Each structure stands twice: as C-alpha cells, then as structure tokens.
Design a protein around this nucleic acid. Structure first.
Ligand SMILES: [Zn+2]
Ligand SMILES: [Zn+2]
Ligand SMILES: [Zn+2]
Ligand SMILES: [Zn+2]
Lengths: 129, 89, 157, 228, 196, 61, 56, 36
RNA sequence: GAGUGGUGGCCACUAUUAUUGGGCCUAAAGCGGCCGUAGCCGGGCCCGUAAGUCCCUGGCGAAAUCCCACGGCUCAACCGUGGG
RNA sequence: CCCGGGUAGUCCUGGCUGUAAAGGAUGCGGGCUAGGUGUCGGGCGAGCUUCGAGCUCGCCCGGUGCCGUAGGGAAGCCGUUAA
C-alpha cells in the first residue's frame, strides 16, 4: 500500500521529466510535498505549482521546465550535523554544489546550503539535481 | 594493542614493470644522477604528501583549517618551491 | 488489491467535493434525525438507512449536515443513533461477519467434505479476528472479549 | 602550421560528394563546431581532415585492439582481423572506430577512417570537491556510460592526479583532452571493445545533462576547443 | 472551404479514413460513423494544406523529394514533381539513395514529402538519418512519429490524392510567384489521377 | 484517470402519475423507490441506471 | 564561445550526434524551430515563439 | 530429497532418476547393515 | 640494489559478503500454494509534550602513538615547545 | 521396444503419506512511464431490429492473448499482465 507520498511524487516527477512531459499531477498532497515543491521552485528546478481541493488529501499541479536530471526521496531519513554534509553531498550529487539536498530542520525544511548558512542540522528528506 | 613501528618514508610503484613509468623514471635518474630508485620515490612521496595536504585543506572549514593552510603555504615558500605571492591553488 | 483474492477492483462511490448541504434538500436536520430514528426502529442497519435516505428522500448524505450539538464535528448515522441511544451494542460489520460465520459453520457440520467452503470460513474468521483486535485497541469492546464459535451462536441468536 | 598546409592541400585536392562536403568546400562552414548539433551526416572523411587536421598526427592516432577472428568453411578456416582504434585532438574532440579486413594494415586504415567519421564533441571542466578551480582539466561532473555488460562511471579529480582508469580508458581520455579523473567500473572490463565504447559513451553523455548558466562559471565548463 | 468548395472535397473523398484509429490524430478526427469508420476534419486539412504550401514555397525548387510507394499515388506525385520542379521517386524507393554516396542516383534534398509513412518507411528512415524536415500525408490510422509537418487526408484514395497534390502544387506556385492568382492555374485536376 | 472524479448519477424531481405527489429520487437506486403517499413504484433498481416510471420535471446536480 | 541549439518543446540542449532537426516556422517563417530526436519520436507538439501556431 | 535441477541435464551423466534410485538402494543397505 | 629470492598468514585485488554497494525466467538461487502471531515498514489535517533529532554551553574520555609549524642533535630517523 | 493373457493399482467409504519440469523455471501490496489490435463479464450512449436475455458501433472499469515506442538485458527476449 501507499507508504511514502514524497517518494511517489519525486519518482513520478523524474519519470515525467525523462519522458519529456510538461505538466504533472501529484496525489495525495501534503504539507511536506508543498514545502519540497516550494524549495524546488525557489531553486528553479520546476515552474508554477498550485493546490487543488477535492474533498480528500488534495492534489498538486506542477509545471516542468525540463531542468531536472534526477529527483528522489532519501530513505531512511538520516540525521545530519552542520559539519557532516560533505559525505552526503558526495554520495547523492555528481559534483560539489551541483544539486541540492532537501533537509527537514527545526526551522522548517530548506536546502542544505541554507542549513549550512544558518548553522543548523537536520534530517535528509530528499535530493534533486 | 601493539606499540609503534617506524614506517618507510617512500612508496614503491604499484606495478614494478610499466614501460612509460620506467622510461620516465630512467630519464629523471639520468638527469639528476641519483644513486637508486628509492631516493626518487622518496621525493615523489614528498610531492604526493604536499598535494594530499593541499587537497584536504581545500575542502576544510575551521580556524585550525585556516592555520594549517597558512602554515603549509609558509613552509612551501620557505623551502622555495612556490613564489612569495603563491596561493593554495 | 483485495486482502485475500489479490485482484484490483476499483468499483466504488464517486463523492463530489462538497462543503455544505445542497440547496434543494427538502428536509431539515431535525427531520433527517427523525427519519433516521424511525428507520432504525423499523430495523434497517446504518447502511440501509443511508441508502434509503439517498434514494427515497433525496438526501445525498448525512455527513454534509453540521452537528448541532458539537460544532467541531459533522453529523453521522451512528452519531445520531447514539445521541438517541439506539447505537448498536456490537459493531455492525463485525456482527455481520459473525452471523455469516455461524451460518457457514452450520452448513459445514452437515457437509464436512466442503473444503473450499471451509477455506472461506477460515478467511471470514481471520477477518473477524482482525476487526476484534482493532476494536480492542480502540476500546470499543472489553479487553477480555474473545471470539469463540460456541458463544457466537448465542450472540447471533 | 604544418597541419594548416595539410588542410590547404587536401582542400585543393578534394571534390565534394555530399551536401556537407559541398558546404565545407564552398566555405559556409569554417569551424568544426558548426558541423555538430545540426543533424547532418558525416560520410566523407575529408571534412574532418580539413576542419580538424591535427587528428592525422601519429601521436594523435591510437590503436586500442587487434583481434584475430575465424569462421569455419568446408575448405578450412577463414581468418579476419578486427582493429579497434581511436583518434582525435587533445582539445575536446575524439572518435572511436572499428575496422575489419583481411590484413592488419587494411583493418587499421579502415578503423582510423571510421573513427574519423565517428568523431564527437565533449565538455570539460572541474567539479571535484578537493580542487574547485575553473580550468578544463577534467570532466565537469560525474558521468555514466554503458555498453554491453561494461558500466563506467567517471568522476572529477583534482589537478595533478593522473587518469585513474584502465589503460585503454586512459588512452581514450588522453586523446579527448581530459587528464584528471577517477573511475568506477562494473562488468567485464577485459572486453576491450565494450570497455572502450563504454568510455566513449561516458564522455559523450557530458552533453546530456542540464546545467544552469551559473554552473558554467562555477565549473569552468568548456565545450569542444578551449581558449586555444 | 477557401481553397476548394466543400462539394469538391466530399467528391474527392478526402474526409474518409479507415476503421482503425490512433490517439496521435484524435485532434484531426472529426466524428465517428455508425459503421465504425472515422471522418477527418476538412477545416484542419485545408489549414494544414495552406501552411504546407507556404512552408514549401521557401525551399529551392530542386531540393524537394516526393515519394509514394502506393500505385494510386505514384502518378500524382510524378505530375506534382514535374509541375513544381521538385524531384519525384514513384514506386520502390532504392535503399541507400539518401544514405549511400556510392549509389548512382545519390541525392540529398532539403525537404521530404511522403504520401504515406507506413508505405514509405524506408524513405522516412533515410530522411531521419540525414536530418531534414519531413512532410507527411497522414490518414486516421497513421502515426505522427518523426513527422515535422502533417497534412490530414485520405492518402489511400485516388481522387483524394489527386486533389491534394493539385491543391498543393497550386499553393506552392502561388506563393513562389509563378502565378499571380489561384485561378490562373490551368492544368485540370482530372489529369492528376490515373485512369482505370 | 480523472484528477477530480465526479459522479455520473444525478438526482431527479419526479411527479407521481397516480396521485401527483412531488419527490426527489436518485438516478441509480439500489432499492425499489416508492411514492411517499400512494406507495406506487417510481424507480426500479437494476445493474445500472434505474428505470423511471414517474414523470420527470428536472435533473438536479 | 558559441551558442548551443536548444529544443523548442522541452528546452533541453541537443547532443552533437542525435537525430534532431531545425527548420523555419512553416506559418510565419521568421522564427526557427528545433526538434530533439526524443521529441520527434514521441510526436511532442511545438509552438512557434511568435505565431502561437502549434503542432507538427 | 532436496532439488538440484542442474542434475537433470544429461550432458555427460546418468539419468538423475536412476542415480536417485541407486542412492536410495545404498542408503537402505547401510541402514540394514547398521541394524535399524 | 646491501639487498634480492622461496614458503605460510592478514588486508586490497573482490560490487566473490554488497548499509554506501551484489544477485535469484533461461547461468547458484522465489518456500507447491494460501491464512496469520512477534518483528520491520505504515493515508491526509489540527492542537499539546519534547523521548529520538538539531544548535549553544559546563565536567570528562591518562600518557605514549597520529597530523601541522618552530627549535636541538650536520638535515633526517629521534626528542622538546605550541595547535589539532 | 512389437503381440496375445494378467496380479497390485486405477473406482467408492473412513484414514496416513505431503511428494512433481507442483513451471509463468518469474514471491507479495503500492505510485508513475506512447500506442495498436483480438476476446470474456459488467455499466453508459447511439443506430438497427423478426422487439429476442437479439445485432452493430463508440466510451469506462476489471479479466485474458499478440505486435510494439522510450527504456532494460550477455543475448534469447521482456516492454501498463515489465524482466
Ligand atoms: Zn580543478
Ligand atoms: Zn404517488
Ligand atoms: Zn511562426
Ligand atoms: Zn526537445
């Protein structure tokens, strides 16, 4: 059965990007999915996205700009400190500062770059490059 | 639990017999008139240690990291391997 | 997929997104509660009461009407029945499963060689045990409650 | 300069046969970067010989494998030579070819010709955590290449660190222009053809990754020939 | 509508497709008859015909291939090529014509026109390899893969093909400047279709 | 398939031909819909859309 | 440097040796259109930056 | 007895059915000799 | 090169132990099939506590050993002074 | 091996044994990734009807086959019934 909506949404986005789609729908919706989409749009990996209510968890409509090489959730959500980011960067990214590691911290979910700037750690929830 | 054992200060080549490496090392030996290959390997590992230190320090953050970077640059300049206005790169 | 048969059947109800009762409903919330109570007195289960309200009286669903006694919740057939004190003592689905399980046992005792029906009975009892565990966890039924066919005979009777 | 007169002489002696050949001879095309990324077909080696004449240097031509091959007939064994060769300039243009013949020389000429026809364009840079300069001495970022059962992963490496890859892989990379890289291979690397083609695909895939304009400045990405 | 009357279109039977259908041409499909046959949209056909004429008027006259393996389409292609100066290859398409420089009839055009993708798969394959624009006459059951320009029409018929190529050649001539008006064109349409 | 599934059934305003009563019924009943006064059948259940035997005045949402 | 052609539909850069095509807009004729090998295979629609005319 | 489908192939080998029968005969002989 | 060979043992070679990071249609390997107890993994929203988690700050984790700079034995091996 | 007879067995009523190339040589639940074309059950719409639980076309869900794009694989081949 359904276990990880975040992983489902990220895999769906990756497959749609590979096929060359321009629009995608994500279901079920959640605050975590919304915040991850917000971060991705902030970094320019996706286009406009909106929320649709249907009497259920809700749906997300996302525009794809053909800028994502690969996006995927990280399981298990490993905790990470401020000084222990290089190993994860090497594991999940091609080059230094190439992609982004979406991390859930005590001050909201933000990219590992913002986490390092704020000097706080968290748990790796996703990655995209 | 074992005590300290003094280690070698040079590293032997991974493969004893490689054509290009043998030719290059022979040219260097003939040019600089060294007694044997262990001296050349000692200098090669000195260079390797310097390069490894620079690589490690490039991606390091912290007061100790800055101190070590400055010390490495100062030591190289004192030895004369780099100009006065050199940079870690 | 299905719990046991393991095949994907996507047949069901398609509820439109709504946030308030339709404007063309001819009955008030009090009248809806009265209808629910009278149907329960007649003897229909909750599902039948809902179906009758949807079909005959043109009430799409009681869940659309807000609860007049608790602003934090919407109405429901079971909630109305327990407001009037008519809520079932045992959950309806569990009771139905137990009833058909005892009927199947009655058939099997006369037909001991019906191994396929015996497997069906085994699946029914597994469903019953799952529901019993869930209800125990939620506190709906006493912790010392256990499913035993001998007692289930009297319970169904 | 010598390669420049070689190009002049071959241009004088060359009569066009294809549309691209006529275009080059007329002069609408004057740089090698203009023949790629347009969907054209390269069926005539004179175009490569003219636009990138340095590929004809013996030091720039390498033979990677020579294989004896046999087929059975009622009269005995028929023996053929398969030669895998690589060509290109040490500035971002490389090509790989396979040639079959009745003799090693015929196979070698055919293989070099096919490599010239198969020449491609790659992107270089620096994306290593330990280097972080802006020179095109390595691959800009980690890339993958698969052929047969051989999977090759190329990772950026710091300047001064040589090619940490099998002999044929480092030969291909040296011909392309790269001089610092780490490798990670899976499968039967002893199959020279498959390994070389996997390295070729890994180098080619550098063009299949989307990069923002800032990444070019960050990694010093250079496409094809550099400041040269 | 504008190029020729709807009566002429229906008489030529450009709107009659086939029993089969594909989603690639759901937009072009107009309706469904009770017999299961699918009808194209004459409006779409006319608009794409005008667009194709404008597009083809910009190319060199002797750099346009017209190919059709269908016997019913061989003659209209030949006459269209004769009128427009384009090269036509009715019948079997020799493999390697566009790919093998050693072939006697080697030629590299700038644009390809195919009467049917399925029947001219070889020519389409070679044109894909060489990398040039492709214009295809597509029927209800035809795929749009590797088709840069698509003209919906009944590419299996006789009168339909003749009328399509007549309208085409007229549009290319009008846009190029050979004729000052559409009605100035003098070659009868009946000449395009073959006899029986 | 649809992102926002919607029902294919509709509610109907029905006038009974025997007594003239007005009522609202479901288009896909699972039971035998009857008039609330004269008790005359209005819609009979089937595998799908019910069979309506009373005059139809309007189709609601 | 030199400009690297990009697709009109997906916007991805076209690789050196793929079956991609380029041609002027059939409708207007000012803006050029580029098609990827993948886009051509999948019959993905394209729109001229000027006209708005859409479809292969 | 456990399943080794690789043994069913007859390339350079006796039929596995008869090898199995012979093995059972040997086991039975050993059991008789032990006296069980 | 005052070393150079032979034999046994450990690590890499080996992504042939695979958390990073292996396989199971035809090469080793999916229980003949299903029900289910512990364990593992678990739909959406709101409020509360902070056990896990993250950040800051005190008391510890002997010395020798390890890395860096300077100084003393001719430089070095070795030792001392500081930082880690 | 071929041909005439033939015991146990093959059949029924209570048991035990728990074994097959028991094979789709493919464990089970979930999300997504072009199409085309056969057929079974159900529902919806239209047209015919000899008014039949009849016939034909289109659409949706669930079954059951073949070809095939992207892609995967050492290849055979798999490809929304994924390998
Ligand atoms: Zn660098
Ligand atoms: Zn009535
Ligand atoms: Zn335009
Ligand atoms: Zn594209």
């Amino acid at each position: 059965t359904l276990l990880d909506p975040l992983a489902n949404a990220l895999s769906h986005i990756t497959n749609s990007e590979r096929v060359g789609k321009r629009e995608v729908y994500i279901k079920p919706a959640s605050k975590l999915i919304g915040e991850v989409l917000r971060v991705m749009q902030k970094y320019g990996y996706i286009g406009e996205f909106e929320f649709i209510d249907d009497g259920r968890a809700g749906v997300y409509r996302v525009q794809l700009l053909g800028r994502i090489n690969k996006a995927g959730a990280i399981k298990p959500r490993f905790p990470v400190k401020v000084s222990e980011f290089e190993k994860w960067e090497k594991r999940f990214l091609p080059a230094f500062e190439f992609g982004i590691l979406i991390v859930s911290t005590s001050q909201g979910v933000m990219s590992h770059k913002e986490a390092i700037e704020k000097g706080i750690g968290g748990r790796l929830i996703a990655y995209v490059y | 639990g074992d005590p300290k054992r003094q280690r070698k200060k040079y590293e032997t080549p991974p493969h004893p017999w490689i054509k290009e490496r043998l030719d290059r090392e022979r040219v260097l030996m003939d040019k600089y008139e060294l007694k044997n290959k262990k001296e050349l390997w000692k200098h090669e590992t000195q260079l390797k240690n310097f390069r490894r230190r620079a690589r490690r320090l490039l991606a390091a953050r912290g007061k100790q990291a800055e101190i070590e970077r400055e010390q490495l640059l100062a030591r190289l300049k004192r030895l004369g391997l780099l100009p006065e206005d050199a940079v870690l790169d | 997929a299905r719990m046991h048969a393991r095949k994907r059947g996507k047949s069901g109800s398609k509820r439109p997104p709504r946030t308030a009762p339709p404007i063309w409903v001819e009955y008030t919330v009090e009248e809806i509660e009265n209808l629910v109570v009278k149907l329960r007195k007649e003897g229909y289960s909750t599902a039948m009461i809902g179906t009758i309200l949807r079909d005959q009286y043109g009430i799409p669903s009681v869940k659309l009407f807000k609860d007049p006694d608790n602003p934090n919740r919407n109405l429901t057939i079971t909630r109305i029945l327990e407001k009037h004190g008519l809520a079932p003592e045992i959950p309806e689905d569990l009771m139905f499963l137990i009833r058909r399980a005892v009927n199947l046992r009655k058939h099997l005792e006369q037909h001991p060689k019906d191994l396929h029906s015996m497997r069906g009975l085994q699946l029914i009892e597994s469903k019953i045990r799952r529901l019993v565990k869930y209800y125990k966890r939620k506190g709906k039924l006493p912790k010392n409650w256990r499913y035993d066919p001998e007692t289930a005979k009297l319970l169904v009777r | 300069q010598e390669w420049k007169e070689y190009a002049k002489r071959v241009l004088d002696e060359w009569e066009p046969k294809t549309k691209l050949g006529m275009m080059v001879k007329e002069g609408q095309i004057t740089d090698i970067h203009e023949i790629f990324r347009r969907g054209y077909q390269i069926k005539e080696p004179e175009i490569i010989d003219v636009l990138l004449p340095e590929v004809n240097a013996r030091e720039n031509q390498e033979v990677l494998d020579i294989a004896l091959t046999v087929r059975m007939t009622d009269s005995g064994r028929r023996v053929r030579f398969r030669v895998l060769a690589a060509v290109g300039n040490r500035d971002g243009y490389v090509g790989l070819g396979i040639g079959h013949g009745k003799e090693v020389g015929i196979a070698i000429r055919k293989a070099i010709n096919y490599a010239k026809l198969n020449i491609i364009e790659i992107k270089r840079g620096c994306g290593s955590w330990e280097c972080r300069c802006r020179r095109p001495h390595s691959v800009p970022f980690a890339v993958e290449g698969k052929e047969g059962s051989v999977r090759v992963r190329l990772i950026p490496g710091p300047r001064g660190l040589g090619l940490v890859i099998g002999d044929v892989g480092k030969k291909i990379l040296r011909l392309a222009g790269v001089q610092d890289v780490w490798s990670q291979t899976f499968g039967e690397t002893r199959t020279t053809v498959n390994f070389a083609k996997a390295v070729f695909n890994a180098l080619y895939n550098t063009n299949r990754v989307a990069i923002s304009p800032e990444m070019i400045e960050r990694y010093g990405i250079v496409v094809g020939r550099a400041m040269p | 509508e504008y190029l020729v009357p709807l009566d002429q279109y229906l008489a030529a039977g450009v709107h009659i497709g086939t029993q089969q259908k594909t989603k690639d041409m759901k937009k072009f499909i107009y309706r469904v008859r009770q017999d299961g046959l699918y009808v194209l949209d004459v409006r779409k056909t006319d608009e794409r015909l005008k667009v194709a004429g404008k597009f083809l008027a910009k190319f060199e006259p002797q750099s346009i291939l017209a190919v059709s393996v269908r016997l019913y389409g061989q003659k209209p292609v030949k006459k269209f090529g004769e009128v427009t100066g384009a090269r036509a290859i009715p019948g079997r398409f020799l493999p390697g014509t566009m790919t093998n420089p050693a072939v006697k009839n080697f030629f590299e055009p700038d644009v390809l026109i195919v009467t049917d993708p399925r029947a001219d798969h070889q020519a389409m394959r070679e044109a894909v390899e060489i990398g040039i624009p492709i214009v295809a006459l597509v029927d209800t059951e035809n795929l749009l893969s590797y088709v840069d320009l698509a003209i919906p029409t009944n590419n299996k018929g006789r009168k339909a093909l003749a009328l399509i190529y007549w309208i085409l050649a007229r549009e290319i001539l009008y846009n190029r400047g050979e004729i000052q008006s559409r009605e100035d064109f003098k070659i009868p349409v009946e000449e395009f279709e073959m006899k029986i | 398939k649809p992102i926002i599934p919607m029902p294919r059934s509709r509610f109907l305003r029905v006038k009974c031909i025997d007594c003239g009563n007005e009522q609202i019924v479901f288009s896909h009943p699972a039971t035998k819909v009857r008039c609330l006064i004269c008790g005359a059948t209005l819609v009979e259940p089937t595998g799908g859309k019910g069979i309506v035997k009373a005059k139809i005045l309007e189709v609601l949402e | 440097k030199f400009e690297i052609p990009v697709c009109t539909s997906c916007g991805r850069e076209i690789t050196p040796r793929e079956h991609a095509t380029h041609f002027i807009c059939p409708n207007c004729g000012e803006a050029v259109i580029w098609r990827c090998e993948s886009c051509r295979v999948l019959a993905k629609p394209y729109k001229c930056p000027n006209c708005g005319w859409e479809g292969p | 007895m456990k399943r080794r489908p690789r043994k069913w192939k007859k390339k350079g080998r006796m039929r596995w059915k008869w090898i199995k029968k012979r093995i059972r005969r040997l086991k039975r002989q050993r059991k008789k000799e032990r006296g069980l």
